[PDB]
């Protein structure tokens, strides 16, 4: 019963119980196309679920690498990092399976195809953040998903569309952080920002706010990366 699982996902969201929420939207997906609303539920849920593990992973990885002259503590940090990393990989794998098995094949409109292919790039990028022989394949999958999303979005979405801007944002981050390619990262971010500038004049107040929020993040990264 899809509508019951959705209403439960919405309660979980209000309750900030994102593991519960993600389980609900996973089950909704394992039916077989998501509304604008259900798509953002799935996205919000997994972003928070994986986000908690990414944050924990960064902190414990930092402790693992910094600890000196305390071998048992260092080992405990390594083992805890590995446990967190296993959770994180399991989350990414689940999301990537939903995308591959259900979401991307059934996506009928360009808006949802770009959304899901961006999501695919994102969760392969999150795997690439932690991958120390599988890394090259993971990175190639991230790049290809982002590029597929990028080409559709360039043809079918306005430059101010938040999904097109957010794709450019995350793809630029992929280039900077994962591929260590700051020049390509800056090019993607600056061009997306400048293409959107051209057309902000046409937007309503709400759409203007939507677009400029992502544009601010683009500018913020460009400022960081060029200092």
């Amino acid at each position: 019963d899809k509508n019951e699982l959705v209403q439960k996902a919405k309660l979980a969201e209000q309750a900030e119980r994102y593991d519960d929420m993600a389980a609900c939207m996973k089950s909704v997906t394992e039916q077989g196309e998501l509304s604008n609303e259900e798509r953002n539920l799935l996205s919000v849920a997994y972003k928070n679920v994986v986000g908690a593990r990414r944050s924990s992973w960064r902190v414990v990885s930092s402790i693992e690498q910094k600890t000196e002259g305390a071998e048992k503590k260092q080992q405990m940090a390594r083992e805890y990092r590995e446990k967190i990393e296993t959770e994180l990989r399991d989350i990414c794998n689940d999301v990537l399976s939903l995308l591959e098995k259900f979401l991307i094949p059934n996506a009928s409109q360009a808006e949802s195809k770009v959304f899901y292919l961006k999501m695919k790039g994102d969760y392969y990028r999150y795997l690439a953040e932690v991958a120390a022989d599988d890394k090259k394949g993971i990175v190639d999958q991230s790049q290809q998903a982002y590029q597929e999303a990028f080409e559709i979005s360039k043809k079918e979405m306005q430059p101010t569309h938040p999904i097109r801007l957010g794709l450019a944002l995350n793809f630029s981050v992929f280039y900077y952080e994962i591929l260590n390619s700051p020049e390509k990262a800056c090019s993607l971010a600056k061009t997306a920002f400048d293409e959107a500038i051209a057309e902000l004049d046409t937007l309503s107040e709400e759409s203007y706010k939507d677009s400029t929020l992502i544009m601010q993040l683009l500018r913020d990264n460009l400022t960081l990366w060029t200092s």
Binding site: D122, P162, L169
Partner: peptide
Amino acid sequence: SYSSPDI
């Protein structure tokens, strides 16, 4: 680096 929030 900042990445995209949700909408």
